[PDB]
């Protein structure tokens, strides 16, 4: 990702070193009074929250390279009581105090635009998810999740589009944002497997019916086409 690579170089040019995190660590947390801009360079994370119950809610997934901001750029205060949890075995991120992100974007509108554009992708992502859920329910949500996994990690092979992610992490990601390991979601996913939309073979998973995923997640398909046209184009 070229635009992201230039942002990494811009961060290091201003003396910002990367930090390494491990699965289950929090890059930022809902209790910290200080808010941050995270430039997630490599790895996979989820945004989580907690209800009074202590129930962990998975709200959103992010992969490197991407920007996640836990506070508003102007007030520097929280956008919500969120944690950013690493779910890949390792992740690399640049962790900047929000007051400094401001200074840096102030001096290079190209990198301002890069971060601005990431927020725009998030906004339209959530609206597309809402639309697909409003049309097709949890099946739209799950097909959308699988569809984005296929486009981001899939590689065409004779056996179909192989998901090139370790099986451990992949099965976590098959679950859409919401409650942890919902049985209703597990049944949806295994039903797609039973119908051979995604199939296990020789220790790997292959999407063999991409059209089915596109059918039930049409608005996330359009979102990805509009948001990441080159990646979309590779498998269409």
- Residues of this chain that interact with ligand C2Q (CB under 6 A) are 44, 61-63, 66, 121-122, 125, 145, 148-149, 152, 173, 227-228
Judge contact between 192 and 138, C-beta under 8 A. Answer: no
Of the residues 59, 95, 152, 235, which one makes contact with a copy of itself according to CB under 8 A: 59
3-state secondary structure (DSSP) of residue 152: helix
The nearest distance, CB 124 to a copy of itself, in angstroms, is 4
Stretch of 101-109, 152-160, 187-195, 196-204 lying at the interface with a copy of itself (CB under 8 A): 101-109
Place of tokens 């950013």: 84
What is the smallest separation between the CB atom of 117 and a copy of itself, expressed in angstroms?
A: 5
> Which CB atom, from 47 or from 105, has the smaller least distance to ligand C2Q?
47
32 lies in the binding site for a copy of itself (CB under 8 A):
no
Site membership for Na ion, residue 229 (CB under 5 A): no
Go through 101-136 and write b for each residue having 16 or more CB atoms within 10 A of its CB, e for each that does not.
beebbeeeeebeebbeebeebbebbeebbebbbeeb
The residue (of 74 and 202) whose beta carbon lies closer to Na ion is 74
| Residue 227, burial from CB neighbour count under 10 angstroms (0-12, 13-18, 19+) | middle
């Amino acid at each position: 990702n070229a635009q992201a690579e230039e942002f990494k170089k811009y961060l290091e040019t201003n003396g910002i070193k990367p930090k390494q995190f491990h699965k289950k660590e929090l890059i930022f947390n809902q209790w910290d009074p200080q808010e941050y801009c995270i430039f997630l360079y490599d790895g996979i994370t989820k945004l989580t929250s907690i209800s009074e119950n202590g129930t962990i809610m998975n709200l959103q997934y992010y992969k490197g390279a991407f920007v996640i901001m836990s506070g508003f750029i102007d007030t520097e205060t929280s956008v919500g009581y969120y944690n950013l949890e690493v779910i890949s075995e390792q992740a690399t991120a640049y962790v900047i105090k929000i007051n400094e992100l401001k200074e840096l974007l102030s001096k290079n509108l190209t990198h301002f635009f890069y971060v601005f554009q990431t927020l725009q992708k998030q906004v339209s992502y959530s609206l597309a998810k809402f639309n697909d859920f409003s049309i097709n329910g949890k099946l739209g949500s799950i097909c959308g999740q699988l569809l984005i996994l296929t486009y981001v990690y899939g590689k065409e092979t004779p056996d179909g589009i192989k998901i090139t992610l370790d099986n451990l992490t992949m099965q976590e990601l098959g679950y859409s944002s919401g409650i942890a390991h919902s049985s209703a979601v597990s049944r949806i996913i295994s039903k797609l497997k039973q119908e051979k939309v995604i199939v296990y073979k020789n220790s790997c998973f292959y999407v063999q019916n991409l059209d089915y995923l596109k059918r039930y997640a049409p608005k996330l398909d359009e979102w990805f086409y509009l948001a990441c046209p080159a990646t979309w184009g590779k498998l269409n």
